[PDB]
Design a protein around this ligand. Structure first.
Ligand SMILES: *[C@@H]1O[C@H](CO)[C@@H](O[C@@H]2O[C@H](CO)[C@@H](O[C@@H]3O[C@H](CO)[C@@H](O)[C@H](O)[C@@H]3O)[C@H](O)[C@H]2NC(C)=O)[C@H](O)[C@H]1NC(C)=O
Ligand SMILES: *[C@@H]1O[C@H](CO)[C@@H](O[C@@H]2O[C@H](CO)[C@@H](O[C@@H]3O[C@H](CO)[C@@H](O)[C@H](O)[C@@H]3O)[C@H](O)[C@H]2NC(C)=O)[C@H](O)[C@H]1NC(C)=O
Ligand SMILES: *[C@@H]1O[C@H](CO)[C@@H](O[C@@H]2O[C@H](CO)[C@@H](O[C@@H]3O[C@H](CO)[C@@H](O)[C@H](O)[C@@H]3O)[C@H](O)[C@H]2NC(C)=O)[C@H](O)[C@H]1NC(C)=O
Ligand SMILES: *[C@@H]1O[C@H](CO)[C@@H](O[C@@H]2O[C@H](CO)[C@@H](O)[C@H](O)[C@H]2NC(C)=O)[C@H](O)[C@H]1NC(C)=O
Ligand SMILES: [Ca+2]
Lengths: 93, 639, 142
C-alpha cells in the first residue's frame, strides 16, 4: 500500500511543478521591462508591425534606444519626458 | 528658597541666552545625516547626546540597548507598472526611491481605485467597490497604517500613497517619501514584551501588521497613473485637477514590493536630574533621534530642544539653586520612524519600575513646524497646566499670549498612533502631552529627503525664537510638575470627559431603551466620581502643605487617577492600549459608541452581546475609578 | 526561583536542541538575589523612627507579590495570573509540563508556545527583580 502512496505523491509533485512553470506573453514582457528598467515593452502580432511601431516611436522620440526582438519591442529612455512620450505614442498609435 | 515666579524669571533668563539654531545646524551636518534607525550616524548622534548629557553633569547618564526588527529596501527594486489587459504593452510607471516599512512583500495586479484619504467615511462614500483591486490614496489625515487597515477591511489587494500638490505644495513632483504601515507601536515582532535578549526573541507577530503590499509613489507617478484612469474626483476632496477615480477597462496596475526584514541594534540615551524630596517620582521628557532622511523638522528640532532643556535645567540646579522635589528624565529615543519603537520597548521593559512613579511624559517631536497656530494634544489631567502655561507664554511672532481661545479644551484632538506620547498615555497610563507651533497644512517635507535645515530656516526665519517659545512651554511644564509639593494634575477635568460620554450616548437612548438597558448606573458613577474629586480638592485645601505625610497620601491618590482608567479586563499583550478613553480596541468608550451606532443600520453588523459586555465593563471601570479615588475601601457608599 | 531552574535542569538537552539557553534565567536569579540583599541591607541601615524611608522600603516590600502577577495575560479570561501559584499557560508549572511533553515524543509538545512561555516568564522574573532593585536609572542591566 505504501508503494502506491509514494507513487501518488510523486505524480502530485510532478503536477504541481508542471503547473508552476506556466508563463504568459505578458510575463515575458514584464521580465523584459524589469530586466533593463525599460519604459515600454510592446508585443506586436508580427515582426512587421513591431518594426513599423518602433520606427514611428524612433521618429517622434529620437533619443530612445529600441530593442526589436521577434514581435517584442523594448524602449529604453534616459528621461521621464521621453518615457511619457514613448508610452503615449505606443499606446495610441 | 525659590518660588514659582523666581523659577519662571530665571528660566526665561536662561532661554534668552540659548542658541537653538546652532545645535539644529549641528544635527544636520554630514556626520549625522542621514540617520536611519540603527545606522552608524544614528549611533554617532547617540554618542554625542550621551557626551552632552555627561558634560551637563546630570545626576546620572545611562543607555538602553535594544535589538529590534525593522524593514528596509531589498536589492530587488519595488515597482509600479501599468499593464494593458489585451497583453500588448507594459509600462513602467515608477521605481520609487522611498518605501513603506512593514509592508508585506508581494506582487499584485488589478484595477486601481482612488480613495480620498483612506478613512472609513471615504471608503463608504465610494461609487466603485475596492474588493480585489488596488487602492491609491493621499496622505495627510490618518497614518499609513490606518489607511492600509481600512483598505484590508474591504479586501483590497494593495495600497499606493502619494502627495498631491494641493495638500503638499512641493515643486519637485518626483520627490520620494517614507512611512510605515504597522497598526501599532514598538517592535512588531515583540508585541507586548521588551525586545531584549533575555526573551530569546520567540516567534510572535503583532496583529497590526498588514497583509497587503503598500508603497509610496511620487506625485509624477500618481499623475502618470491618472493618465490611465477615468472619472473626475469629487469637488469636496479639494485636490488637483489631474485626479481621476478608476482605471479604464483596458488598463490594470501591477505593484511589486519586496522589502526585507532586518535586525538592528538601537540605543536609547538617558539623563536624570534627581529630585531633592521625592526622587523616586519623575517626569519624562523625550524626543526622537532617528530619521529616514535628514529629519531636521522630524528629529533635529526635538533633539536640540532635549539637549537645551537638559543643559538649562542642570545649570539651574547647579548654579541657580533650583531644587526640584521630583526627578526629571531626558530621553533620546531611536526607531521612532517605525512607530515609536524605542519608547514603546522601553515602556514594555520597565513597566514594573514606572508603575506609579513616572507621572508625566512630555514629547518634543515636531514641536516647530510653523508659526500660525499653537496646537496641543494631551491627557485631560494636564489641561489646567497647559492653560496656565498658555496664559503667560508669549507667541514668538505676534508677542501676544498663546491663550486666545477660552474654549480650547473642548477642541483638543486626542493623541494619535504616530505620536510618541500615545504609548505613554494609552498603554502605561502616564499622563502625556505633545505640542507644536504649526500651520493649518502639514509640513510637506516630513519623511522626505528635503527635510533639511535650509528648508526649515527658509520657511521659518524666526526659527530661534519659535524654538525658544517651545522650550519655554516645555520648561514651564517641567517646573510646575517638579518644583512644588502639589503635582498640578487636575483630576476634576475628567468630570467634563464623563459628561461628554453620556451625552454621546443620548443620541442612542431609544436603542438603550429597547434592549432593556438603563443609563442610570452611569449617571450614578458620574456622581460618585464628581463627589470624589470634590472631596479630594477640599482635602487638599484643608491640608497643611508642610505636613509631608498627608500630602503624600493625597498625592498618591492623585497619581493613581490615570492608571485606573486602563481597562483591567483585557490582555495587555494583545491589547496594549488599555486606556478606555484614549486607547484602541473594543474596551474603549469610542468602540462602545461605534458598536452602538451599528444598531440603527438594521443589518447584522451590530453585536448585542459584545455591546452588553462593553457597557458593563466600562460602567465598572468608571465606578471603580470613583471608588478608588474616594478613599479607603470601607468608606465607599453603595445604594 | 532556585527550585524553578532546578526543575528545568532535567530538560537541558531539550533547551539545547531548541537553540535556547538558561543563562538569562540565572542572570535574573542573580539580579533578584541582589535586590533582596540590598533591600535587607537598607532595612538594616535605616532608622525605624524615620517614617518616610520606612514607608518607601515598605512600599518596595508590598510590590513583591504584585510583580509576580503575569502582566501579559487577560485578567478576565485567566484571573489566576500569579506565575507561581496561578493556573494557565502563563505559569511556571505549565511551562514545565509543556517542556516535559518534548521528551515524551508525542505530538503534544508546542514549541512556539514554549518559546513564548519562556520569554514571558523570564521577563516577568527580571522585571520583578528590576522593580525591587530600586529606581529605574539604578538598574544595572547590560
Ligand atoms: C468585488 O465584489 C463583487 C461582489 O462579490 C464581485 O463581483 C461578483 O463576481 C462574481 C463572479 O465574478 C459574481 O457571481 C455571479 O453573480 C451573478 C449575479 O447575478 C450570478 O447570476 C452568477 O451565477 C454568479 O454567481 C457576482 O454576482 C459579482 N457581484 C456583483 C455585484 O456583480 C467582484 O468580482 C469583486 N471584485 C473583484 C476585483 O474581484
Ligand atoms: C542578542 O541578540 C542579538 C540579535 O539576535 C545578537 O546579535 C546577533 O548575533 C548573531 C550571532 O552572533 C550575529 O550573526 C553573526 O554575524 C556574523 C557577522 O556576519 C557572522 O560571521 C555569523 O555567522 C553570524 O551570522 C548577528 O549579526 C547579530 N546581530 C546584530 C544586529 O548585531 C547578540 O549576539 C545577542 N547577544 C547576546 C549576549 O546573546
Ligand atoms: C459578537 O461578540 C461576541 C463577544 O466577543 C462574540 O462571541 C465570542 O465568540 C468567540 C468566537 O466564537 C468566542 O471565542 C472563544 O474564546 C475562548 C477563550 O478561551 C475559546 O476557548 C473558544 O474556543 C472561542 O475561541 C468568545 O468566547 C465569544 N464571546 C462571548 C462573550 O460570547 C461573537 O462571535 C460576536 N458575533 C459576531 C457575529 O461576530
Ligand atoms: C501552539 O501554541 C500557539 C500559541 O498559543 C497556538 O497558536 C494559536 O493559534 C490559534 C489558531 O490555531 C490562534 O487563534 C492564536 O492567535 C495562536 N496564538 C498565538 C499566541 O499566536 C497554536 O494553535 C498551538 N498549536 C497547537 C497544535 O495547539
Ligand atoms: Ca516589544
Amino acid at each position: 500500500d505504501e508503494r502506491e502512496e509514494e507513487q501518488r505523491r510523486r505524480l502530485e509533485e510532478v503536477k504541481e511543478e508542471a503547473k508552476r512553470r506556466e508563463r504568459s506573453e505578458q510575463d515575458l514582457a514584464v521580465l523584459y521591462l524589469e530586466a533593463v528598467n525599460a519604459a515600454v515593452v510592446f508585443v506586436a502580432d508580427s515582426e512587421e508591425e513591431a518594426k513599423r511601431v518602433a520606427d514611428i516611436v524612433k521618429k517622434l522620440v529620437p533619443e530612445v534606444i529600441i530593442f526589436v526582438h521577434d514581435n517584442f519591442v523594448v524602449f529604453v529612455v534616459d528621461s521621464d519626458e521621453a518615457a511619457r512620450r514613448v508610452y503615449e505614442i505606443v499606446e495610441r498609435a | 528658597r525659590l518660588y514659582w515666579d523666581d523659577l519662571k524669571r530665571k528660566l526665561s533668563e536662561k532661554l534668552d541666552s540659548t542658541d537653538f539654531t546652532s545645535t539644529i545646524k549641528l544635527l544636520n551636518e554630514n556626520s549625522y545625516v542621514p540617520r536611519e534607525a540603527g545606522s552608524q550616524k544614528d549611533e554617532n548622534l547617540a554618542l554625542y547626546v550621551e557626551n552632552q548629557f555627561r558634560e551637563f553633569k546630570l545626576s546620572k547618564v545611562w543607555r538602553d540597548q535594544h535589538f529590534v526588527k525593522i524593514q528596509v529596501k531589498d536589492s530587488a527594486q519595488n515597482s509600479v507598472i501599468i499593464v494593458d489587459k489585451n497583453g500588448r504593452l507594459v509600462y513602467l510607471v515608477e521605481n520609487p526611491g522611498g518605501y513603506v516599512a512593514y509592508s508585506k512583500a508581494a506582487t499584485v495586479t488589478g484595477k486601481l481605485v482612488h480613495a480620498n484619504f483612506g478613512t472609513k467615511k471615504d471608503f463608504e462614500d465610494l461609487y466603485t467597490p475596492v474588493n480585489g483591486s488596488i487602492v491609491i490614496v493621499r496622505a495627510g489625515k490618518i497614518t499609513f497604517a490606518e489607511k492600509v487597515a481600512n483598505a484590508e477591511s474591504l479586501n483590497a489587494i494593495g495600497v499606493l500613497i502619494y502627495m498631491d500638490q494641493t495638500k503638499f505644495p512641493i515643486v519637485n513632483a518626483e520627490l520620494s517619501f517614507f512611512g510605515h504601515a504597522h497598526l501599532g507601536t514598538g517592535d512588531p515582532y515583540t508585541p507586548g514584551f521588551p525586545s531584549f535578549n533575555h526573551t530569546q526573541f520567540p516567534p510572535s507577530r503583532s496583529s497590526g501588521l498588514p497583509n497587503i503590499p503598500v508603497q509610496t509613489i511620487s506625485r509624477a507617478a500618481a499623475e502618470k497613473l491618472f493618465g490611465n484612469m477615468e472619472g473626475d474626483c469629487p469637488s469636496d476632496w479639494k485636490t488637483d485637477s489631474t485626479c481621476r477615480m478608476v482605471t479604464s477597462e483596458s488598463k490594470n496596475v501591477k505593484l511589486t514590493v519586496s522589502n526585507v526584514l532586518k535586525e538592528i541594534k538601537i540605543l536609547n540615551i538617558f539623563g536624570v536630574i534627581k529630585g531633592f524630596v521625592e526622587p523616586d517620582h519623575y517626569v519624562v521628557v523625550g524626543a526622537q533621534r532617528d530619521a529616514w532622511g535628514p529629519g531636521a523638522a522630524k528629529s533635529g528640532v526635538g533633539t536640540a530642544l532635549l539637549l537645551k532643556l537638559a543643559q538649562m535645567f542642570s545649570d539651574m540646579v547647579l548654579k541657580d539653586g533650583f531644587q526640584p522635589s521630583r526627578s526629571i528624565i531626558f530621553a533620546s529615543w531611536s526607531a521612532g520612524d517605525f512607530g515609536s519603537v524605542g519608547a514603546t520597548e522601553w515602556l514594555e521593559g520597565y513597566l514594573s519600575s514606572l508603575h506609579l512613579k513616572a507621572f508625566t511624559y512630555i514629547n518634543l517631536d515636531k514641536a516647530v513646524l510653523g508659526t500660525s497656530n499653537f496646537k496641543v494634544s494631551a491627557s485631560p489631567l494636564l489641561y489646567t497646566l497647559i492653560e496656565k502655561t498658555m496664559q503667560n507664554v508669549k507667541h514668538p511672532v505676534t508677542g501676544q499670549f498663546l491663550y486666545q481661545d477660552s474654549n480650547w479644551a473642548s477642541k483638543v484632538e486626542k493623541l494619535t498612533l504616530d505620536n510618541a506620547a500615545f504609548p505613554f498615555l494609552a498603554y502605561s497610563g502616564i499622563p502625556a502631552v505633545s505640542f507644536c507651533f504649526c500651520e493649518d497644512t502639514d509640513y510637506p517635507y516630513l519623511g522626505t529627503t528635503m527635510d533639511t535645515y535650509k528648508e526649515l530656516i527658509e520657511r521659518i526665519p524666526e526659527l530661534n525664537k519659535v524654538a525658544r517659545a517651545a522650550a519655554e512651554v516645555a520648561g514651564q511644564f517641567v517646573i510646575k510638575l517638579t518644583h512644588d509639593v502639589e503635582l498640578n494634575l487636575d483630576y476634576e477635568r475628567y468630570n467634563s470627559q464623563l459628561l461628554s460620554f453620556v451625552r454621546d450616548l443620548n443620541q442612542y437612548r431609544a436603542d438603550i431603551k429597547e434592549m432593556g438597558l438603563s443609563l442610570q448606573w452611569l449617571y450614578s458613577a458620574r456622581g460618585d466620581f464628581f463627589r470624589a474629586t470634590s472631596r479630594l480638592t477640599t482635602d487638599f485645601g484643608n491640608a497643611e502643605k508642610t505636613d509631608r505625610f498627608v500630602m503624600k497620601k493625597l498625592n498618591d491618590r492623585v497619581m493613581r487617577v490615570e492608571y485606573h482608567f486602563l481597562s483591567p479586563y483585557v490582555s495587555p499583550k494583545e491589547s496594549p492600549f488599555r486606556h478606555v478613553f484614549w486607547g484602541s480596541g473594543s474596551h474603549t468608550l469610542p468602540a462602545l459608541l461605534e458598536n452602538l451606532k451599528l444598531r440603527k443600520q438594521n443589518n447584522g453588523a451590530f453585536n448585542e452581546t459584545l455591546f452588553r459586555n462593553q457597557l458593563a465593563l466600562a460602567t465598572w471601570t468608571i465606578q471603580g475609578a470613583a471608588n478608588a479615588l474616594s478613599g479607603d475601601v470601607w468608606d465607599i457608599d453603595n445604594e
